[PDB]
Amino acid sequence: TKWDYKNKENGPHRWDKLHKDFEVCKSGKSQSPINIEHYYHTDLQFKYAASKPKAVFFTHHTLKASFEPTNHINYRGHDYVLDNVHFHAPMEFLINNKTRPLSAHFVHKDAKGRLLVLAIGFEEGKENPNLDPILEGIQKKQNFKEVALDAFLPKSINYYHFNGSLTAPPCTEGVAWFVIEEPLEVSAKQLAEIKKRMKNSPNQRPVQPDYNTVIIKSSAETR
Amino acid sequence: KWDYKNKENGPHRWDKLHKDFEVCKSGKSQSPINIEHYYHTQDKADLQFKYAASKPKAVFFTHHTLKASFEPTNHINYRGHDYVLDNVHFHAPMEFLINNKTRPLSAHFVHKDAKGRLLVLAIGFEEGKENPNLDPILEGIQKKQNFKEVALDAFLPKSINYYHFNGSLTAPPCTEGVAWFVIEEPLEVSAKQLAEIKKRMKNSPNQRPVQPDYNTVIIKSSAETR
Ligand SMILES: CC(=O)Nc1nnc(S(N)(=O)=O)s1
Ligand SMILES: CC(=O)Nc1nnc(S(N)(=O)=O)s1
Ligand SMILES: [Cl-]
Ligand SMILES: [Cl-]
Ligand SMILES: [Zn+2]
Ligand SMILES: [Zn+2]
């Protein structure tokens, strides 16, 4: 069958049934997303640059932009190369039970195959020029307009870091999550646009059981 | 049948012996680990002890360990969650490594709350002064009924430094979602206590090798146990 976000046979409460591959979606004790609500206050380097997408496409219910392996985040002496950035409407992670209309995930992998994913919400407000090459380029196959990855995130960020899982099947654990507290802005026309291309259909996995995930809250400079 | 020797049933093959033991290989948050990257933090009063001297319901050898079980009269309260102490058992050598450094012995204080959530407390021993606290266990195991009270309210240090993370049981079925608190400060043990303890664990190492670490989030803090 084909996993989706509907309230029926293939929906999130039933991903585990569709494939044995997806069983950890139910049996796992560190599944994402969660409500980030209880945490501790208290080594992250960015190597992003304007990058022309390898491809920009709609896949498995998300708007996805893939990249050549030229961008990295270095964490605790290991490089995690950015594979792709994709979008969720609404945001999957809740910070103290507050949702944003959109979020973006920056998905990275190190040499051992370990995953590090960075999440950040969007706020309804002013236009965000960075969204445009992705929105302009679903429409193309070839020389894509560069995504300003080095301008995308806040210069100064406050983040929550915890151990979790992929928020979509096969829901693999061992994902190093960094969730940024600061919203980016997106216009009313851009959001409606982005939400419409993901078929006016919510692609937000519900909050999963939280087994007292150890979450630290900190801050860093992205540039 | 699972064991710690280098043949069919050893640590490398636990996932193969039973399908319940599959998370022993497939898990992304398996224990023990080398504790070497961690975050320093506040003393948020998260961890409060309600311990008292307790006579073991039993002291016995099971699954390569020497175990003392207790009545549900002892607690750990964490972040507004109460965990009742189930048992104390031993590992030789110590399973969690602190900054890649060895210990000859460790103790795990295994707790379970009403929902079945697991919290385990670990502390190492070093060769030195004799430890009187171990003696009712060494003395109580060649006996079967009346066990001497274990001074649970005295076993741990009054002031502790610990590392807290979520991990797994270090023995099959390697269940994850285990709340680990590893106390950095060691307790003491004599050469005779260490040797007999090992003989009561049949002079056979019951130490799980270190498993892969997927960027485990560890906070380092401190508390007063009494
Ligand atoms: C190739 C790839 O990135 N696959 C992903 N599956 N789930 C993800 S999520 N919502 O946890 O970021 S990413
Ligand atoms: C009943 C019981 O306590 N079972 C345990 N299995 N593994 C444990 S450990 N070494 O992670 O503390 S405890
Ligand atoms: Cl998110
Ligand atoms: Cl230990
Ligand atoms: Zn995502
Ligand atoms: Zn143990």
Numbering used by the authors:
A (entry chain B): 21 to 62, 67 to 247
B (entry chain A): 22 to 247
Q: How does the study describe this entry?
A:
Bacterial carbonic anhydrases (CAs, EC 4.2.1.1), metalloenzymes that catalyse the hydration of carbon dioxide to bicarbonate and hydrogen ions, are emerging as new potential drug candidates due to their role in the survival, invasion and pathogenicity of bacteria. H. pylori has two different CAs, α-class and β-class (HpαCA and HpβCA). Here, we report structural analyses correlated with inhibition data, on complexes of HpαCA with AAZ and MZA. The structure reveals a fold characteristic of other αCAs of the known structure which contains a central 10-stranded, twisted β-sheet flanked by helices α1 and α2 on one side and α3–α5 on the other.
In both structures, the N atom of the sulfonamide moiety of the inhibitor acts as the fourth ligand in the tetrahedral coordination sphere for the zinc ion. The O1 atom of the sulfonamide group forms a hydrogen bond with the main-chain amide of Thr191. The sulfonamide group of AAZ is further stabilised by van der Waals contacts with the side chains of Val141 and Trp201. The thiadiazole moiety of AAZ stacks against the hydrophobic side of the cone-shaped surface leading into the active site and makes van der Waals contacts with Val131, Leu190 and Ala192. The AAZ molecule is further stabilised through a hydrogen bond between the O3 atom of its acetamido group and the Nδ atom of Asn108 (3.1 Å) and van der Vaals contact with the side chain of Lys88. Structural superimpositions showed that the positions of the AAZ molecule and the zinc ion are very similar in all eight subunits in the asymmetric unit. Superposition of the structures of the HpαCA/AAZ, SspCA/AAZ, TaCA/AAZ and HCAII/AAZ complexes shows a very good overlap of the zinc-coordinating sulfonamide moieties and only subtle differences in the orientation of the AAZ molecule, consistent with the absolute conservation of the protein residues that are important for AAZ recognition. In addition, examination of the superposition of the HpαCA/AAZ complex with the structures of free and substrate (CO2)-bound HCAII reveals that two sulfonamide oxygen atoms of AAZ are positioned close to the putative location of the oxygens of the CO2 substrate in the Michaelis complex (0.8 Å and 0.4 Å). Furthermore, in this superimposition the zinc-coordinating sulfonamide nitrogen occupies the position of the catalytic water/hydroxide ion Wat263. Thus, our analysis suggests that AAZ acts as a site-directed inhibitor by mimicking the catalytic transition state of the CO2 hydration reaction, which is in agreement with the tight binding reported for this inhibitor (Ki = 21 nM).
